[PDB]
Nucleic acid binder design. Structure first.
Ligand SMILES: [Zn+2]
Ligand SMILES: [Zn+2]
Ligand SMILES: [Zn+2]
Lengths: 224, 816, 77, 99, 111, 76, 128, 81
RNA sequence: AUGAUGUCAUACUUAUCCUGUCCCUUUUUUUUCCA
């Protein structure tokens, strides 16, 4: 479905070029999508974030409110992924400052290892034939490359809750989502867990139209 | 190529997967006739991977098993060469924690082996009984159970004889033994036609060297006993002895399952066997009463429950034999600390009580009411409560009852959780002491009262509760000083301001007044109720619930130790309980409006209800309009109908709708005595069915519904005809509530007026140009048809016959 | 419209109902079958016909149940 | 804030009762208090407050004062006859048109 | 006296183990009968045999010996004869002397 | 209590309305047997005063009104 | 379409007016519209218990002794917007005369509508 | 939403919130006949529950006399699942 | 002379709610002319 396999199960140039990456094929499809969408740098840094996320923001009990605040600062319209994008952007902007993350309630470990994974990604980028491009502030390309990677990882609104696009099994939004109260109609995620209730992490609001742009063979219109 | 084409046209499984139910009909029928030609050769390889595809859904599975079963019925022969494949790919489903995977694999394998070529099964699944893997042996064994479901044991039983008499492998003897136990699980009663054939099958392995086969065969004995209820050892005696000896000459897992089977046969047994067998096994039991092991404890205690619970275990036997070590080693803190042991120790100890009485068991668990792990004394009262509640307290002697009452008092004070445990324990224990409790009422109350004095709310509330429990026996032992006490002292505490205590106080006062009637209450209700009226303003759900309960009792029965003016003030206070957030309160309020209308006359309360109808915010209107209905029901409706009707003239909306809704409820409540006021009410409903608003016509329609169902059979059909004329035009409507009340009016009106009249109203618009009107008339005619489809046979029109059909019914116009 | 899943389940539930497109043929044939099932059920119209023609109750109900198959002509088209 | 309906109920109340009985007017209004009533009338609904365009001499005087007495808008406003919020917005507006 | 609600035909099993109730189209049920402990009869919930587009000219219990009881109905199928605009399928349709069978172990009725 | 305060706020508002339509002498007014308001001109039904006043601040009230005057001076 | 007009309140049945409820209710209405909030709550706390009375057998005789069949419409005559507006006329059986007809034609009203041949029966006798 | 898989001989029950109303008609009065449910909405954790609340089966769901006059009580387990 | 369009607040309906809700374990992936 992602396009690494032919209809008989062998390797496309897509499949190999993604396979050289020591990172999941969904991510790999998104990185290839940066090629089409000319959002190279931004999709790169996003990948760098999802590599390690699980520990980004320190959330201490003894400084909950100032913490929620140095977090709520960056909260961008569009979703957690471009949130991470701006966060990294601002950190390196500060000159890879540790006190920066110390002031802004971010785990320096996560940030700097993510930077390293992006830099070696760039060191892979010549082989995977990617042109170093910026989206020029056009987050539409960004969300669309996110789709071209993570179309599978989607849910839609149901009046009985947020529910999958395919299996129509019932999910919920993580409390700490930058969209957690926004609650969008057409949803993309990155995790699929079921903690105390079914959950999904690193979620974003999408267009169902990009879905017929990208995967009319996997996502047909009548199902949206 | 024709084969790839046949699959191409065969994928109208899309016609069946997607589509209309028309699509389903076209494809289902065509394939159910094309099944032989299209064959399961190509089908099965298309078919298995979808039935195994991870997210084929409930009804996809349902439809595809529809397909497999009917195409296998069709192609009894034309499914032949794919048997082992279907078999092994579906096999894990019968042994599977999805009951419906078990069911659906079961059903399709039934039909598969059913229309199948027979020998095939045997041929494929002989060499797998000898196999090396217990995994595959269990899978094929429970398969064989399903295949016996599909065909029948008889055709197979000698091959079972083989797979169980094998001298090559113990693997295969174990396999046959579990095949045995598996059918014994599945078909259940269906075994008695054999009933010993399988016993023969199994006699070989309870003596066997492999503990696996030995002990699964013990469990086979268990399962066969289970499906083979009290009909005893006319079959099972053929193996009773290896069980008997291994029980002692064994240790461990065999002890477990072999004890399980023997205790499953201990019901089916008889005296000269169920005396020797039990009496023998009891000494095993006494050595196992100290067994640390959990499933040990389960099996041995279940055993004991049935075993020392027969008629051939003497009272004396148990009391001198089982009880001392049983009580010693299970009445340690460990068992109540345990999550399983609490309840199951209960089970068997209550049963031993059922066996041998209370004057020893009660005595053996008295002082466990004063142990440490509050869970423990909690358990002991759980038991005692169950016990005396089922049995009665006849034989409980003096000193026993003393230590019991005292451990009771302790448990209840010591209480440290908000639980009904100790409450119910107390209630039951005195409920059974009956009249035995006379001399400790100073003790019991003095305790409760000192608690009622405490600093923290919770214990105060508890003591109020406990009073509300023992309230009845408090009197029934003639507690002049003491029940008088509780009366006046609670009249004291009526001044609390912790809602949680005030509510319980009201509860306890109510539960005293229930036993002791009004005219000997210790505070005369002549001073009680005046004290209660300023509490009705306490804006809290629990105290409000209990207060309105108490005032409702009083206004029902007392009602004359109070003055009209008091009742009027209390009316004015009830008028704003109709906004509580809890519905029990509001229903209680309406009931007491009824009682007050009975005590005082109806007219003043009705005047105070109309003025409330003038309020906004509909919750109050709905309740008051209910209350008006209730007043009218008790004090006959002619007293209130003129005032309601006349109030239908005040030009405001909420009130005209209040009048209409109240008549709705009224005709519901009175019922068959509407044959009087139907005439009075019609010109008001026709008035409000000629428009005034949506809600106006919605409500007049509800009124028509209930009038019709009340006046069924009393001849007031001209009036309901007249109102049909006015209701039927609303048939084209859109608002859900409006059209819905209309449809309801037409079902009521259908029983009350008959189905001719309504089929005639529904005639002309069945075949109308439009589609909105066609659809409403077919909705109605559907509901007219479902109910009373059989009258209509004499109500259908005369519909002439054209050229190539016959349409007249000559049956009906034979002359005679 | 899940109401409709239930409602054409109702059409599947009660043989003889209708919908806004139903044809004179389905309508009148369903009423004709129902007429037959009740002539059989009610023990007395059976005597009426048995006596009207000179047949006997076995004869009567056999005719009726034969007729139950194509009572009102052949189908529509 | 304030909505056409309430503004007109205010207008009616005031024009009846008079312009110093703020507590009863407040009582007519659901969820409005006399502080807000008085403020609303004296800034936006009073008809001696003019919503027109600035004479050139008004404006030149405006800038003259805002240089004489910088940031004292309540003191400046009455010397030219608009409310201080009007004066303030128009002064920033002239500053920015010449920005 | 409806058409698809059971009651017109009713048969038993010769030994007295189950009853079947049946309509003249689409519906038949079966009831199981067991003496209680005190031998005062009980009757559990009913089974099902809903099969569309099918008459019944009779239903009767077949005499088996302590097997699953089972019943012989006639049948017919007006279905096609109402799909054929020619009246051919009116003729050329055949009664189908059929047996349904209990399965008291698995508690259902199998064709 | 707030419910009675609300009921009488309502009633006072209604008298305010009757006063203004008195001081503005309206022949295009009705209070119907359900306690709403009408425009006998535009056949508009209103719950409350504020809405009635906004109605009579003619936009479609104005159109139908000027049409009424035009056809009146037409026929007479 | 009924939206536009003004409409007069519902008109009770005679046998219910007769029992004189309406005047009781009018009086109570005017009382409680005049009374002021403070006095309202004062009467809430000290009720005017049994201000009024109206006797039974007046009611029970209305509802059980003078209750009478209203005018009903037989099968078929659905009410539509303006159905009620149609008024009983089309009295084609000659003899059909009205009292205003008699007055504004010169003939008599009442028991003399028989013994009064109308001015058209004059030329009926004259030329047919 | 309805179960409606056909009736049986197993009585239904009411939580105490839901105590008193009919199952569909939503009445509070004159109940005549007892409710019966299907085996499938009878089994297991659904034994003795509130057809409406889902709460514990304590009081008996009943049928308003109107519902029995119109025989809306002859359809089977009406459980809102 | 009644259109849909509406980010209109108010009024209103269901004896419709006030009891159907909440925070991740562990950890790894080769790299390329410098200028
Ligand atoms: Zn109901
Ligand atoms: Zn069910
Ligand atoms: Zn409930």
């Amino acid at each position: 479905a992602l396009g690494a396999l032919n209809h008989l199960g062998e390797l496309t140039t897509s499949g190999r070029k993604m396979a050289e990456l020591p990172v999941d094929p969904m991510l790999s499809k998104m990185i290839l999508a940066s090629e089409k969408y000319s959002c190279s740098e931004e999709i790169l840094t996003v990948a760098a974030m999802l590599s390690v996320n699980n520990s980004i923001f320190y959330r201490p009990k003894d400084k909950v409110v100032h913490a929620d605040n140095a977090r709520v600062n960056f909260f961008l319209p569009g979703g957690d992924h471009l949130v991470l994008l701006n966060v990294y952007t601002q950190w390196a902007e500060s000159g890879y400052s540790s006190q920066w993350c110390y002031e802004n309630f971010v785990q320096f470990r996560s940030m700097r290892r993510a930077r390293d994974v992006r830099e070696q990604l760039e060191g892979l980028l010549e082989r995977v034939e990617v042109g170093l491009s910026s989206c020029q502030g056009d987050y539409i390309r960004v969300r669309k490359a996110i789709t071209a990677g993570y179309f599978y990882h989607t849910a839609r609104l149901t009046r009985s809750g947020y529910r999958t696009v395919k299996q129509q099994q019932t999910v919920f939004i993580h409390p700490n989502s930058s969209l957690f109260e926004q609650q969008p109609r057409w949803l993309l995620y990155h995790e699929l867990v079921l903690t105390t209730k079914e959950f999904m992490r690193q979620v974003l609001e999408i267009e169902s139209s990009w879905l017929l742009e990208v995967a009319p063979h996997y996502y047909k219109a009548k199902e949206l | 190529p024709e084969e790839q084409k046949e699959r191409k046209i065969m994928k109208l499984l899309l016609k069946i997967k997607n589509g209309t139910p028309p699509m389903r009909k076209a494809a289902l029928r065509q394939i159910t006739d094309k099944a032989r030609e299209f064959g399961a050769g190509p089908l099965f390889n298309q078919i298995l991977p979808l039935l195994m595809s991870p997210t084929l859904e409930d009804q996809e599975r349902h439809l595809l098993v529809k397909v497999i079963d009917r195409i296998l019925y069709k192609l009894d022969d034309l499914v032949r060469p794919y048997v082992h494949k279907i078999l092994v790919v579906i096999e894990p489903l019968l042994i599977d924690e999805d009951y419906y995977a078990r069911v659906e694999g079961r059903e399709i394998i039934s039909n598969l082996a059913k229309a199948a070529g027979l020998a095939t099964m045997i041929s494929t699944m002989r060499p797998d009984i000898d196999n090396m893997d217990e995994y595959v042996r269990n899978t094929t064994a429970r398969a064989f159970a399903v295949v016996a479901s599909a065909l029948g044991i008889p055709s197979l039983l000698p091959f079972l004889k083989a797979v169980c008499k094998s001298k090559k492998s113990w693997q295969a003897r174990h396999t046959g033994i579990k095949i045995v136990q598996q059918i014994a699980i599945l078909m259940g009663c269906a075994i008695l036609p054999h009933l010993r054939s399988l016993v023969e099958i199994i006699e070989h392995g309870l003596v066997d060297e492999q503990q696996k086969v030995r002990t699964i065969s013990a469990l086979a004995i268990a399962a066969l006993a289970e499906a083979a209820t009290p009909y005893g050892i006319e079959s099972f005696d053929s193996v009773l002895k290896p069980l008997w000896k291994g029980i002692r000459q064994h240790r461990g897992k065999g002890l477990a399952a072999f004890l399980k089977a023997i205790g499953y046969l201990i019901p089916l047994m008889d005296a000269e066997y169920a005396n020797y067998y039990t009496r023998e096994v009891m000494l095993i039991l006494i050595r196992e009463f100290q067994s640390p092991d959990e499933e040990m404890k389960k099996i041995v205690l279940k055993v004991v429950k049935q075993c020392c619970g027969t008629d051939g275990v003497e009272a004396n036997y148990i009391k001198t034999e089982i009880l001392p070590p049983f009580f010693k080693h299970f009445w340690q803190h460990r068992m109540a600390l345990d999550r399983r042991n609490y309840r199951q120790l209960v089970d068997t100890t209550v049963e031993l009580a059922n066996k041998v009485g209370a004057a020893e068991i009660i005595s053996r668990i008295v002082d466990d009411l004063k142990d440490e792990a509050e869970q423990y004394r909690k358990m002991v009262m759980e038991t005692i409560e169950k016990i005396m509640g089922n049995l009665g307290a006849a034989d409980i002697d003096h000193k026993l009852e003393e230590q019991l009452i005292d451990g009771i008092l302790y448990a209840f004070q010591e209480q440290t959780t908000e639980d009904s445990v100790m409450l119910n324990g107390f209630g039951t224990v005195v409920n059974a002491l009956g009249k035995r409790v006379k001399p400790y009422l100073p003790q019991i109350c003095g305790t409760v009262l000192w608690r009622l004095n405490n600093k923290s709310a919770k214990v105060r509330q508890q003591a109020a509760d406990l009073i509300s429990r023992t309230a009845v026996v408090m009197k029934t032992c003639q507690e002049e000083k003491l029940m008088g006490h509780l009366g006046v002292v609670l009249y004291e505490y009526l001044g609390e301001e912790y809602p949680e205590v005030l509510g319980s106080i009201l509860g306890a006062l109510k539960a005293i007044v229930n036993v002791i009637g009004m005219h000997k209450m210790t505070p005369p209700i002549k001073d009680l109720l005046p004290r209660l009226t300023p509490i009705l303003k306490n804006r809290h759900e629990k105290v409000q619930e209990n207060c309105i309960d108490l005032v409702g009792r009083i206004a029902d029965r007392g009602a004359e130790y109070v003055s009209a003016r008091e009742w009027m003030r209390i009316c004015f206070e009830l008028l704003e309980l109709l906004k509580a957030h809890k519905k029990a309160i509001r229903r209680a309020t309406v009931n007491t409006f009824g009682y007050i209308a009975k005590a005082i006359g109806p007219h003043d309360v009705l005047a105070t209800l109309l003025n409330n109808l003038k309020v906004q915010e509909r919750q109050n209107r709905v309740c008051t309009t209910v209350a008006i209905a209730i007043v009218a029901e008790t004090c006959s409706p002619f007293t209130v109908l003129p005032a309601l009707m006349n109030e239908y003239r005040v030009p405001e909306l909420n009130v005209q709708n209040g009048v209409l809704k109240s008549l709705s409820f009224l005709f519901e409540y009175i019922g068959e005595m509407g044959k009087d006021y139907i005439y009075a009410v019609t010109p008001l409903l026709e008035d409000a069915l000629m428009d005034r608003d949506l809600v106006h016509r919605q409500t007049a329609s509800a009124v028509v519904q209930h009038m019709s169902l009340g006046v069924y059979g009393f001849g007031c059909e001209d009036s309901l005809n007249h109102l049909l004329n006015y209701v039927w035009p609303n048939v084209f409507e859109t608002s859900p509530h409006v059209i819905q009340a209309v449809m309801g009016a037409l079902e009521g009106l259908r029983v009350a007026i008959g189905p001719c009249r309504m089929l005639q109203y529904c005639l002309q618009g069945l075949f109308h140009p439009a589609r909105k009107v066609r659809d409403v008339y077919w909705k109605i005619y559907n509901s007219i048809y479902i109910g009373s489809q059989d009258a209509l046979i004499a109500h259908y029109p005369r519909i002439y016959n054209d050229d190539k059909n016959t349409y007249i019914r000559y049956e009906l116009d034979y002359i005679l | 419209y899940t109401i409709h899943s239930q409602l054409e389940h109702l059409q599947s539930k009660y043989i003889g109902t209708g919908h806004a497109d139903t044809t004179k043929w389905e309508w009148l044939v369903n009423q004709h079958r129902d007429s037959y099932c009740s002539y059989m059920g009610h023990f007395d119209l059976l005597n009426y016909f048995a006596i009207a023609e000179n047949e006997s109750k076995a004869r009567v109900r056999f005719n009726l149940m034969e007729k139950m198959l194509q009572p009102c002509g052949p189908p529509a088209d | 804030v304030w909505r056409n309906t309430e503004d007109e109920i205010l207008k009616a109340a005031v024009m009846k009762y008079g312009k110093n009985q703020w507590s009863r007017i407040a009582s007519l209004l659901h969820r409005k208090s006399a502080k807000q009533c008085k403020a609303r009338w004296y800034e936006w609904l009073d008809p001696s407050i003019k919503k027109t365009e600035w004479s050139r001499e008004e404006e030149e005087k405006l800038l003259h004062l805002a240089k004489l007495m910088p940031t004292q808008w309540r003191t400046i406003a009455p010397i030219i006859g608009r409310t201080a919020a009007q004066c303030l917005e128009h002064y920033e507006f002239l500053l920015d048109k010449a920005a | 006296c409806r058409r698809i609600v059971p009651g017109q035909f009713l048969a038993v099993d010769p030994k007295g183990r189950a009853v079947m109730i049946s309509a003249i189209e689409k519906q038949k049920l079966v009831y199981i009968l067991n003496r209680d402990a005190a031998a005062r009869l009980t009757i559990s919930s009913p089974l099902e045999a809903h099969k569309a587009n099918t008459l019944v000219y009779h239903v009767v219990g077949v005499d088996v010996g302590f097997e699953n009881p089972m019943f012989a109905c006639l049948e017919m199928d007006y279905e096609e004869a109402d799909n054929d605009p020619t009246g051919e399928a009116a003729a050329n349709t055949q009664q189908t002397l059929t047996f349904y069978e209990l399965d008291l172990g698995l508690n259902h009725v199998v064709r | 209590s707030s419910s009675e305060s609300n009921r009488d706020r309502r009633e006072r508002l209604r008298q305010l309305a009757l006063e203004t339509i008195d001081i503005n002498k309206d022949p295009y007014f009705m209070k119907n047997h359900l306690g709403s308001y009408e425009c006998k001109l535009c056949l508009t039904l209103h719950n409350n005063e504020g809405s009635y006043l906004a109605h009579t601040q003619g936009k479609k009230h104005q159109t139908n009104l000027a049409r009424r005057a035009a056809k009146e001076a037409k026929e007479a | 379409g009924k939206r536009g007009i003004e409409k007069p309140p519902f008109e009770l049945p005679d046998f219910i007016k007769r029992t004189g409820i309406q005047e009781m209710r009018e009086a109570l209405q005017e009382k409680e519209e005049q009374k002021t909030m403070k006095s309202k709550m004062r009467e809430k706390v000290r009720p005017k218990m049994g201000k009024i009375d109206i006797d039974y057998q007046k009611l029970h005789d209305a509802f059980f002794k003078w209750q009478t069949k209203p005018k009903l419409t037989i099968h078929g005559d659905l009410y539509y917007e303006g159905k009620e507006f149609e008024t009983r006329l089309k009295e084609k059986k000659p003899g059909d005369l009205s009292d205003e007809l008699r007055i504004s034609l010169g003939m008599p009203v009442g028991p003399n509508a028989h013994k009064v041949p109308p001015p058209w029966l004059i030329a009926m006798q004259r030329y047919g | 939403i309805f179960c409606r898989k056909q009736a049986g001989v197993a009585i239904g029950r009411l939580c105490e919130k839901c105590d008193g109303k009919c199952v569909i008609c939503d009445s509070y009065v004159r109940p005549c006949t007892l409710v019966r449910i299907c085996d499938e909405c009878n089994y297991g954790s659904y034994q003795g529950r509130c057809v409406i609340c889902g709460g514990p089966g304590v009081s008996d769901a009943y049928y308003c006399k109107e519902c029995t006059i119109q025989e809306k009580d002859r359809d089977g387990c009406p459980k809102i699942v």
